[PDB]
């Protein structure tokens, strides 16, 4: 899958902490998660998880679904390269 349009959900989220000039602890502490909890998120070492996605539209701002849709992209990127559906066809009215 080509990554070109679908950028890392941490760094749109580390994108807008930039334009907001807020600091990773402050941007925990504004979540209520650890710091370390924050930095997971921001570098990628962990999945935006539907927890995080509601938390962020408060804090950041837009739709859950509009963080979660970031994640899915990357982790049907990660999906991709263990699925086979070279065999599969679309199914037609029987």
């Given at each position: 899958?080509?990554?070109?349009?679908?950028?890392?959900?941490?760094?749109?989220?580390?994108?807008?902490?930039?334009?907001?000039?807020?600091?990773?602890?402050?941007?925990?502490?504004?979540?209520?998660?650890?710091?370390?909890?924050?930095?997971?998120?921001?570098?990628?070492?962990?999945?935006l998880?539907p927890?995080?996605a509601?938390?962020?539209?408060?804090?950041?701002?837009?739709?859950p679904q509009?963080w979660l849709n970031l994640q899915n992209?990357?982790?049907?990127?990660?999906?991709?390269?263990?699925?086979?559906?070279?065999?599969?066809?679309?199914?037609?009215?029987?």
């Open positions: 899958m080509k990554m070109a349009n679908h950028p890392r959900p941490g760094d749109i989220i580390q994108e807008s902490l930039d334009e907001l000039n807020v600091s990773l602890r402050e941007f925990a502490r504004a979540m209520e998660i650890a710091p370390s909890t924050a930095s997971r998120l921001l570098t990628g070492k962990a999945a998880t927890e995080m509601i938390k962020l539209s408060v804090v950041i701002g837009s739709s509009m992209a990357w982790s049907l990127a990660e999906a991709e390269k263990t699925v086979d559906v070279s065999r599969l066809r679309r199914l037609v009215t029987q």
